Design an enzyme around this catalytic site. Structure first.
Site, PDB file in Angstrom:
ATOM      1  N   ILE A  13       0.853  -1.201   0.000  1.00  0.00           N
ATOM      2  CA  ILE A  13       0.000   0.000   0.000  1.00  0.00           C
ATOM      3  C   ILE A  13       0.881   1.241   0.000  1.00  0.00           C
ATOM      4  O   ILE A  13       0.738   2.107  -0.869  1.00  0.00           O
ATOM      5  CB  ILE A  13      -1.093  -0.008   1.108  1.00  0.00           C
ATOM      6  CG1 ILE A  13      -2.140  -1.082   0.792  1.00  0.00           C
ATOM      7  CG2 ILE A  13      -1.768   1.399   1.227  1.00  0.00           C
ATOM      8  CD1 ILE A  13      -3.050  -1.465   2.013  1.00  0.00           C
ATOM      9  N   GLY A  19       7.586   2.394   9.343  1.00  0.00           N
ATOM     10  CA  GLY A  19       7.105   1.139   8.773  1.00  0.00           C
ATOM     11  C   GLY A  19       6.524   1.226   7.375  1.00  0.00           C
ATOM     12  O   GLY A  19       6.760   2.193   6.635  1.00  0.00           O
ATOM     13  N   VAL A  21       2.886  -0.247   4.972  1.00  0.00           N
ATOM     14  CA  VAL A  21       1.555  -0.830   4.978  1.00  0.00           C
ATOM     15  C   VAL A  21       1.330  -1.752   3.765  1.00  0.00           C
ATOM     16  O   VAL A  21       1.749  -1.460   2.653  1.00  0.00           O
ATOM     17  CB  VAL A  21       0.473   0.280   5.133  1.00  0.00           C
ATOM     18  CG1 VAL A  21      -0.928  -0.329   5.259  1.00  0.00           C
ATOM     19  CG2 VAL A  21       0.777   1.186   6.347  1.00  0.00           C
ATOM     20  N   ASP A 135      -1.882  14.296  15.365  1.00  0.00           N
ATOM     21  CA  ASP A 135      -1.549  14.303  13.946  1.00  0.00           C
ATOM     22  C   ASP A 135      -2.786  14.058  13.073  1.00  0.00           C
ATOM     23  O   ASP A 135      -2.740  13.273  12.113  1.00  0.00           O
ATOM     24  CB  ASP A 135      -0.421  13.298  13.610  1.00  0.00           C
ATOM     25  CG  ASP A 135       0.149  13.453  12.209  1.00  0.00           C
ATOM     26  OD1 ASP A 135       0.002  14.549  11.622  1.00  0.00           O
ATOM     27  OD2 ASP A 135       0.647  12.456  11.665  1.00  0.00           O
TER      28      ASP A 135
END
Length: 303
Positions: A13, A19, A21, A135
Site C-alpha cells: 500500500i 514502517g 503498509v 496528527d
C-alpha cells in the site's frame, strides 16, 4: 501462533512515517498490515500500546486486530494488523470523488464522533483515558464501505491521567504534520503539560479536514477541486516557519467560498470551521459539541 504466521501479504500500500503498509489475507479476509523493522520497535510498541487502550473500540476509530512478531529466517518483522478499508484515506477519497450534501455530513459527523470518543474520558473499573491524536489530517482518516470515516494512525497519540492532570509520555517537543499544526503549536506558545491544549489543537486540525470535505460537496454540479488546506499560501511539504508566517503572523485561514452560504448544510459546516480556527484554543468548539451540531443537521437532511 494465530496472527502473522497465518497472514499472506498480497499488495504493497505504501511506506509512511514509520514502517510500511500492506494488504494481507487473514482467515480469508482482507486485513491492513503495518510492518516495522527491528530498529523501529519504539514506534511499533507505542502504536500497539495506544490501540490496546481499554474501551478504545468505536465505529469511528480504526479497528485494531493484533500486534505480532514474524521471523522470516533472516530478520524479525514487527506487525500491527487492523481492519482493511478499500477506499483508503479520506485524502484519497476526496481526490477521487465529489460528495453529495448527505455524503459530506456522513464524512464530517463520523470524523467528529470518532474524535469525541478519542477525547472522552470514560470513568470506571474498565475506564478509558482521554486521548489526543496530535496528527489529525485527511491522510490519517479512513473511509469505510458505508461512507463513514474512522480515525487511524494513532501512533503519535498522548493519553491523559485525569486524577493528576498529567500525560502518559509527558511530550516536550512538537510532532505531527506541519500543514495541520495549530497556531499555538507553530509559535510554541502551547503548554504541553496541559492535556486540554492537545484536544484543542486536534480540533483546529479537524476544522481544516472539514474544509477539505466541504470543497468536494457538489450541489447543482457545482464544487471546488480537491486542495490541501493552505494550498494557496504555502509550498508542498511546508516548514514550521512557512506555516507560522501564514497562520500566526499574517493570521490567515483557508478561504470560505461565498457559495457555502447557499444551503443550510454548507452554512453549518462553514460556521464549525470558523469556530475550530480561532487562534485562542480555549475559544474553539469541542468535538462533542461538533458531533451534536452535525447529528442535528443529519436528522434534518434524513440521512
Amino acid at each position: 501462533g494465530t496472527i502473522a504466521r497465518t497472514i499472506v501479504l498480497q499488495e504493497s500500500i505504501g511506506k509512511g512515517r514509520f514502517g510500511e503498509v500492506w494488504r494481507g489475507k487473514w482467515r480469508g479476509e482482507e486485513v491492513a498490515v503495518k510492518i516495522f523493522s527491528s530498529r523501529e520497535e519504539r514506534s511499533w510498541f507505542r502504536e500497539a500500546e495506544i490501540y490496546q487502550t481499554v474501551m478504545l473500540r468505536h465505529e469511528n476509530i480504526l479497528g485494531f486486530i493484533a500486534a505480532d512478531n514474524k521471523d522470516n529466517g533472516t530478520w524479525t518483522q514487527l506487525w500491527l494488523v487492523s481492519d482493511y478499508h478499500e477506499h483508503g484515506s479520506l485524502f484519497d477519497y476526496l481526490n477521487r470523488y465529489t460528495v453529495t450534501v448527505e455524503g459530506m455530513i456522513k464524512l464530517a459527523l463520523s470524523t467528529a464522533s470518532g474524535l469525541a470518543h478519542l477525547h472522552m474520558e470514560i470513568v470506571g473499573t474498565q475506564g478509558k483515558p482521554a486521548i489526543a491524536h496530535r496528527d489529525l489530517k485527511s491522510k490519517n482518516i479512513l473511509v469505510k464501505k458505508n461512507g463513514t470515516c474512522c480515525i487511524a494512525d494513532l501512533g503519535l497519540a498522548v493519553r491523559h491521567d485525569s486524577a493528576t492532570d498529567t500525560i502518559d509520555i509527558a511530550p516536550n517537543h512538537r510532532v505531527g504534520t506541519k500543514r495541520y499544526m495549530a497556531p499555538e503549536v507553530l509559535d510554541d506558545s502551547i503548554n504541553m503539560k496541559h492535556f486540554e491544549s492537545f484536544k484543542r489543537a486536534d480540533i483546529y486540525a479537524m476544522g481544516l479536514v472539514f474544509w477539505e470535505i466541504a470543497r468536494r460537496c457538489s450541489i447543482g454540479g457545482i464544487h471546488e477541486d480537491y486542495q490541501l488546506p493552505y494550498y494557496d499560501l504555502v509550498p508542498s511539504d511546508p516548514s514550521v516557519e512557512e506555516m507560522r508566517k501564514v497562520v500566526c503572523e499574517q493570521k490567515l485561514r483557508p478561504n470560505i467560498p461565498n457559495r457555502w452560504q447557499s444551503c443550510e448544510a454548507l452554512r453549518v459546516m462553514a460556521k464549525i470551521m470558523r469556530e475550530c480556527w480561532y487562534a485562542n484554543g480555549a475559544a474553539r468548539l469541542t468535538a462533542l459539541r461538533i458531533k451534536k451540531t452535525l447529528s442535528q443537521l443529519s436528522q434534518q437532511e434524513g440521512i
